[PDB]
């Protein structure tokens, strides 16, 4: 008399990946396994009463592989195990892009250099964590929106690096916000907008 887990969903942002499910356990515990094929199963969260399991350490080993997960239900320590398969998950194609942050927007002469902070992830290589830019390379684009604080109409520009060098009218203050987008995706394509930064 156990309840099969249901509504198994992947919650992932910048590769930080957690599998979630229902229900809150009642006299039972769960074990979650992960694999990349059929017979590659590895248990990661053993007999927990939690309804989530962080699987980051596993998926970051290779963010472009497709992972399968299964959640087993077992009777608790008081008085055939049921299990359910999760949806497939491919990190590189599905992790959500986190909110960007503008690092600086220095105006030198008639130009403003807008630099986006590179974001470190849990994905590591050569004994070092990788930045979002490191992982995606040119697959990642930043859209900039800018406007004169003293006017209505916005302007825009894009870059496949982390900086924008834009012309501005002298003696004018502009506001800026950036957004990340992965053109090759069909869903979860964009991040939310960065906080707005304004000159002066």
């Amino acid at each position, epitope marked *: 008399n156990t309840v099969a887990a249901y509504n198994l969903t992947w919650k992932s942002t910048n590769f930080k990946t957690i599998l979630e499910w229902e229900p809150k356990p009642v006299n039972q515990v769960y074990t979650v396994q992960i694999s990349t094929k059929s017979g590659d199963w590895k248990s990661k969260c053993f007999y927990t009463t939690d309804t989530e399991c962080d699987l980051t350490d596993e998926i970051v080993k290779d963010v472009k592989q497709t992972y399968l997960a299964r959640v087993f239900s077992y009777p608790a320590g008081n008085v055939e195990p049921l299990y359910e398969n999760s949806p497939e998950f491919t990190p590189y194609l599905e992790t959500n892009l986190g909110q960007p942050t503008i690092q600086s927007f220095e105006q030198v002469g008639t130009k403003v250099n807008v630099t986006v902070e590179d974001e470190r992830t849990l994905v590591r290589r050569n004994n070092t964590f990788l930045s979002l830019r490191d992982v995606f390379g040119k697959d990642l*684009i930043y*859209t900039l*929106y800018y406007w004169k604080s003293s006017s209505s*109409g*916005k*302007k*825009t*520009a*894009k*870059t496949n690096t982390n900086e924008f060098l*834009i012309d501005v009218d002298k003696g004018e203050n502009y506001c800026f916000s950036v*957004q990340a*987008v992965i*053109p*090759s995706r*069909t*869903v*979860n*394509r*964009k991040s*939310t*907008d960065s906080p707005v930064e304004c000159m002066g």
Partner: antibody
Amino acid sequence: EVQLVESGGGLVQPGGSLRLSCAASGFNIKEYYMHWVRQAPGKGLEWVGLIDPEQGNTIYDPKFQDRATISADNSKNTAYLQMNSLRAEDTAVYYCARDTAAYFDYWGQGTLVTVSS
Amino acid sequence: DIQMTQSPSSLSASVGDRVTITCRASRDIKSYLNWYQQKPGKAPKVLIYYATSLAEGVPSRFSGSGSGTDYTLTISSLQPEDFATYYCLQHGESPWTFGQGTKVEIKR
């Protein structure tokens, strides 16, 4: 299956306003940037503007900034274009296009606006 | 804005001929230059994006090259179905700007 269907075309009196809609299906417009592009009879493509349904940001070509309004309704998954004080040169086929940030990958069928009395 | 000058305005070529169309920007556009093909009574269709990338499903006879201010669309061996008007588009910054187009006529 992605589809963009425009409507609102037809006659507009000189000095009047065209008011068009672009109904999208098969995807959520908030995932992309939606643009309007027009083409006068026998002439070239002309960019009008874009709207980012993520937050409603709109960018207009300077030629249309003071006479047009682009908007979007995520709940109706529809984008719109209104342009005012129309003259003969505004008679054209108006297209709605989906922008992936790399290119336009889907287009509406286009709708003709004829400025006439 | 950034003016895009497309050359020639029209050309006539036989099936099997190599065809070259060029687009020059008034200033560096950093390869955010696409090529679109438009047939009679239809919406434009992407051929090349980011200056040199062939869009999915587009025949290999179409290719793009260039960087900075100068770009070229090449059709290595013209086919009858390539009759169309071709347009370049600068989209790295607003306002986005289209070239004036090149009408390709087929000699037969």
